[PDB]
C-alpha cells in the first residue's frame, strides 16, 4: 500500500509543521544566580499565538525584557519576583520548596532550571501537596501524583485563559482558523472512508473497519491505528 | 478545466536557462543546478554509463 | 493382526532354520554430525533456505511392518519386506 497519513507527518513537511515563524516566545523561567533579587514590572499583556492564551510582557530590574507565562490575575503595573526569596503571591516564581503546601501552581519544571514543562495550558494548574527535604509531591492537571525535586521552580496561581474549552466552535470555519495556528493537518478524513491501499481500515463495499480497532503496542508504524493498546473500550462495565 | 490546451496558457515561467559552465539551456534558474552538466551540484561533470549502450 | 514373538524360520547368517525373535524397529537417535546436518547449517541464510525451508510431509493411511528378526542362536538379526498392517500385536 501507501504510507498512511500518520507516516507522512513525521517527515516534517510544511503541511504538518507549526507556523513557528509566527510564534512569539518560548516562555521559560528566568535564570537567577541566587539571592532572588530579581523583580520586574508587567509592561503589557499580549496574545500568545501558540497557546490561545494571554501572556505577560515583563521588564526586569537588570534591563531584561521578556514574555512570561501568565497566571490569571496579572495586570500591567503589577510587580513580579523570581527567586528563592520571592514573595508568596500570584504571578511570582520560586522553587517548590519555598512554596506553601496547598497552593495552586503552574509552569512547573521537570528538572530544576529547565524553565517549566508542566501545567501551561489555558486555565490549568498543578497542586503542590507534600513537602520534604528529598521530594515535593505535586498533583498535575491529569490527576497524577508527580514526585519532583523541591528545587524545581514554579509560578504561583493558575494559568490565564481558563474556560476556553467551555464554548463550542459551532462552525468548521472557527476550527479552521485555530488549526492554522498549530502544527496539524486538518480536516480529518476517516480511515474507513479511504481505499484499502491508503489505510488499514480502508476498502469494503460499505464503511466499517475490517478488523478489531484495538491494536497492539508492538504494531509497526503504518499499522498502529485505531485504539492503541486500549486497556478497555466503550463506556459500559 | 482541461489538463491539455487550457492548462498550457499559464506557462510563462522561466526555469531552464543557458548554463555558464556547459552552454546548454539546462541551468535551472530556480534550483541553480544544471540538469545537463551538473553545474551547481558537483565540481565533477555530470555523466552516466546509461547514457550509452552497456557494451559501448 | 497378531504375530508370534518367536518362531522357526531361515537365518541368512547361520544359513539354516532356527528360532528367531521378532522385534519392532526402534528409531535410533541422530548425532547431528552427518553431511546433511552440516549442509543445513552451511546453506541456511538470509531469506528462504530452499530445501531447508520445507516441512514434514503427511501420512499414508496404513504403514508397512517394520521389524527385526533375531536368530536365537547366533544373535544376528536380518530385515524383511514389510506388509501393510493397521496394527501389529505380538503373541507372548
Amino acid at each position: 500500500g501507501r504510507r498512511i497519513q500518520g507516516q507522512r507527518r513525521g517527515r516534517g513537511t510544511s503541511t504538518f509543521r507549526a507556523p513557528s515563524h509566527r510564534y512569539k516566545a518560548d516562555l521559560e523561567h528566568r535564570k537567577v544566580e541566587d539571592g532572588d533579587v530579581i523583580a520586574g514590572t508587567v509592561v503589557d499583556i499580549e496574545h500568545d499565538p501558540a497557546r490561545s492564551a494571554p501572556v505577560a510582557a515583563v521588564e526586569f530590574e537588570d534591563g531584561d525584557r521578556r514574555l512570561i507565562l501568565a497566571p490569571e490575575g496579572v495586570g500591567v503595573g503589577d510587580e513580579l519576583q523570581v527567586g528563592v526569596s520571592a514573595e508568596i503571591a500570584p504571578g511570582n516564581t520560586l522553587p517548590l520548596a519555598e512554596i506553601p503546601e496547598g497552593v495552586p501552581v503552574c509552569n512547573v519544571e521537570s528538572s530544576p532550571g529547565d524553565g517549566g514543562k508542566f501545567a501551561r495550558a489555558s486555565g490549568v494548574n498543578a497542586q503542590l501537596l507534600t513537602h520534604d527535604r528529598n521530594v515535593a509531591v505535586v498533583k498535575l492537571p491529569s490527576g497524577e501524583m508527580k514526585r519532583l525535586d523541591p528545587q524545581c521552580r514554579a509560578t504561583i496561581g493558575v494559568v490565564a485563559g481558563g474556560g476556553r474549552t467551555d464554548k463550542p466552535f459551532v462552525k468548521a470555519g472557527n476550527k479552521h482558523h485555530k488549526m492554522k495556528a498549530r502544527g496539524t493537518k486538518w480536516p480529518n478524513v476517516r480511515g474507513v472512508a479511504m481505499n484499502a491501499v491508503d489505510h488499514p481500515f480502508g476498502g469494503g463495499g460499505r464503511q466499517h473497519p475490517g478488523k478489531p480497532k484495538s491494536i497492539s503496542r508492538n504494531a509497526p508504524p503504518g499499522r498502529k491505528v485505531g485504539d492503541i493498546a486500549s486497556k478497555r473500550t466503550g463506556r459500559g462495565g | 478545466t482541461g489538463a491539455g490546451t487550457p492548462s498550457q496558457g499559464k506557462k510563462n515561467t522561466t526555469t531552464h536557462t543557458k548554463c555558464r559552465r556547459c552552454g546548454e539551456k539546462s541551468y535551472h534558474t530556480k534550483k541553480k543546478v544544471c540538469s545537463s552538466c551538473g553545474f551547481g551540484k558537483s565540481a565533477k561533470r555530470r555523466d552516466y554509463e546509461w547514457q550509452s549502450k552497456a557494451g559501448e | 493382526m497378531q504375530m508370534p514373538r518367536r518362531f522357526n524360520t531361515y537365518c541368512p547368517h547361520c544359513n539354516e532354520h532356527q528360532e528367531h525373535e521378532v522385534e519392532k524397529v526402534r528409531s535410533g537417535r541422530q548425532t547431528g554430525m552427518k553431511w546433511i546436518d552440516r549442509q543445513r547449517e552451511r546453506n541456511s541464510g538470509i531469506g528462504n533456505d530452499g530445501k531447508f525451508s520445507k516441512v514434514p510431509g503427511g501420512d499414508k493411511p496404513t504403514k508397512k511392518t517394520d521389524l527385526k528378526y533375531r536368530c536365537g542362536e547366533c544373535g544376528k538379526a536380518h530385515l524383511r519386506e514389510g506388509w501393510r498392517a493397521g496394527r501389529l500385536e505380538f503373541q507372548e
Binding site: - | - | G45, I46, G47, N48
Partner: protein
C-alpha cells in the same frame, strides 16, 4: 637485552590488564570528546608505529580516527527483491573498520599518503585506530632511503585502491597458495568472487 619498545608491545597484548587498562579507561574519556580525525604529535603505540614504518622525522604524520562499531548501516529495499536480497540487519560491509579509518584519515589530509595503521582500542560503540601518513612532497622524505618509495606517482591515493597493508589483507592476498585462487592478482580480475 630487551629494547624499551618491547615493553610497550607487551603491554598492548592485553589492553584490559595492568596500567594500560587504567590508561585507556582515562584516555577514551577524552577521545570520545575529540573529533573523527585528530592529528596527534606522538604515536600512542611507539613500537607498533616504528615497526610499521614510522620515523620521528619531518613529513611523517599520525592521526587517530574513530569509527562506529558493528554491521552495515543499510537501508531496506524500496523495490522488488527476492527473499535472499531482502536482508538489512545481518549485512556487513566487505571493508573492515580499520580500512574505513584509513580512508577517512587520508581524505582529511588530501596531500598526504597512508603508510600504515594500527588499533588503539575500542569502547562499546566505536573503534579507534592511529594512521601513519607521509608527505610525499617534503624533501626530508624524498631523500629518505626507507620511505622515498611512497613518493612515486603510482603510489597516489594508494589507500583508496587497497594498496595499504590492511587493504591487501582485507583483499585476501595474505596467502600465496591454497585459498587465493580468486584474490590474486586482484579481486576484479577474478570476476569479484574473492
Amino acid at each position: 637485552a630487551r629494547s624499551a619498545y618491547s615493553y610497550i608491545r607487551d603491554a598492548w597484548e592485553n589492553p584490559g590488564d595492568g596500567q594500560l587498562a587504567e590508561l585507556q579507561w582515562q584516555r577514551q574519556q577524552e577521545w570520545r570528546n575529540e573529533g573523527a580525525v585528530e592529528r596527534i604529535e606522538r604515536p600512542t603505540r611507539l613500537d607498533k608505529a616504528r615497526s610499521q614504518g614510522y620515523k620521528a622525522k619531518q613529513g611523517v604524520i599520525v592521526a587517530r580516527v574513530s569509527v562506529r562499531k558493528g554491521s552495515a548501516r543499510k537501508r531496506r529495499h524500496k523495490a522488488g527483491r527476492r527473499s535472499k536480497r531482502q536482508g538489512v540487519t545481518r549485512i556487513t560491509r566487505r571493508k573492515d573498520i580499520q580500512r574505513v579509518a584509513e580512508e577517512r584519515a587520508s581524505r582529511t589530509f588530501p596531500n598526504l599518503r597512508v603508510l600504515n595503521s594500527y588499533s588503539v582500542g575500542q569502547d562499546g560503540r566505536q573503534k579507534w585506530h592511529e594512521v601513519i601518513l607521509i608527505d610525499p612532497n617534503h624533501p626530508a622524505i624524498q631523500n629518505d632511503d626507507d620511505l622515498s618509495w611512497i613518493c612515486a606517482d603510482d603510489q597516489a591515493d594508494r589507500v583508496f585502491r587497497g594498496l595499504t597493508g590492511a587493504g591487501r589483507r582485507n583483499r585476501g592476498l595474505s596467502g600465496k597458495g591454497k585459498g587465493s585462487e580468486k584474490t590474486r592478482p586482484s579481486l576484479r580480475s577474478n570476476g569479484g568472487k574473492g
